[PDB]
């Protein structure tokens, strides 16, 4: 039931996840997300084979202490990496209902605390950003908290090249991470915010 801030003030709408936000599940979430961003890069000649080296050495017996194959194996400096790392993906598909319960339960999080909406920002005017900062002030955004701005509106976002403060974000292509990432959410666009199915 959050009161709008720009050009209206409905709010109330939106059932929020019971009981009251659950890290566990927000954890189950975030994690999954990163796993997906986690790229696969394993520089490692794990293979006693992938390394450069001959294949027959000295003499199995009678050379006086030894017993060796090639000079390319786990046990030889410069040999190969036993159980080393090879490329992969660590990407799995987290059940959909959780990705749902995800941000949902994350919005709550933000509502129960420092939530914030906005219907259009004629308060901007061009790119400037200067004035975008302007609004922020009388908008409560001192410049002491990480702000995430979800909303379409090409020209609006164009105002946010300022650090620590805000972090821009298109077509409600939000994300449990970012939101939970920065402090206050500027949910903005009542787009993804009110009306589904």
């Amino acid at each position: 039931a959050q009161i709008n801030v720009i050009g209206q003030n409905g709010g109330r709408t939106i059932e929020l996840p019971l009981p009251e936000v659950n890290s566990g599940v927000l954890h189950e979430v975030v994690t999954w997300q990163l796993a997906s961003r986690r790229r696969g890069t394993a520089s490692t000649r794990t293979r006693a084979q992938v390394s450069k080296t001959g294949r027959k050495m000295y003499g199995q017996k009678g050379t006086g202490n030894a017993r060796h194959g090639d000079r390319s194996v786990p046990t030889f400096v410069g040999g190969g990496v036993a159980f080393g790392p090879k490329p992969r993906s660590y990407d799995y598909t987290l059940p959909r209902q959780v990705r749902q319960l995800g941000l949902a339960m994350a919005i709550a999080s933000r509502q129960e605390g420092g939530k914030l909406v906005a219907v259009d920002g004629f308060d901007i005017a061009d790119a400037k950003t200067k004035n975008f900062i302007s609004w922020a002030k009388q908008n409560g955004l001192d410049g002491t908290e990480k702000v995430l701005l979800v909303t379409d509106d090409e020209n609006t976002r164009r105002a946010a090249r300022n650090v620590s403060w805000v972090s821009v974000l298109p077509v409600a292509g939000v994300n449990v991470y970012d939101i939970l990432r920065h402090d206050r959410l500027v949910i903005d666009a009542a787009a993804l915010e009110i009306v589904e199915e």
Partner: protein, 141 residues
């Protein structure tokens, strides 16, 4: 500025039971895993084999895989569901998305009522239970 590691993206714990630590073979100064001989660095002593009862045991039967019918229990229709319409469709959403195979009707549920079913197949007392309370079992010509 006092001191406070803050709660949030960092205050987001696991779940407990959520995920236990792995197992690196070395529990106390005293690990030298696997039996204590006759087994290691390989893999073939499997778990099956063909002499350990497998073989020796008699059989030739004969596999067929004819037709497998979609058992649509009686209580599925009666009890609840106001003749939401069997036909050869709705039943899907009603819940019996088997596709590919036929559709048999069997007598499990029991409450009595009038309902006309269009199963692709049905049993004796299957039919002899429907009409016997209203409704018509309908098999393909």
């Amino acid at each position: 500025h006092d001191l406070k590691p803050t709660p949030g993206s960092r205050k987001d714990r696991k779940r407990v039971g959520r995920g236990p630590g792995g197992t690196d073979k070395t529990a106390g100064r005293g690990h030298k895993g696997q039996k204590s001989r006759s087994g290691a660095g390989k893999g073939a002593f499997f778990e099956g084999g063909r002499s350990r009862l497998i073989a020796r045991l008699p059989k030739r039967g004969f596999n067929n895989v004819g037709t497998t019918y979609e058992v649509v229990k009686l209580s599925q229709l009666q009890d609840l569901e106001d003749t939401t319409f069997d036909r050869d469709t709705l039943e899907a959403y009603r819940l019996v998305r088997r596709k590919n195979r036929p559709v048999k009707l069997l007598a499990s549920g029991e409450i009595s009522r009038a309902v006309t079913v269009h199963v692709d197949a049905a049993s004796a007392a299957a039919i002899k239970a429907v009409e016997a309370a209203g409704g018509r079992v309908v098999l393909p010509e």
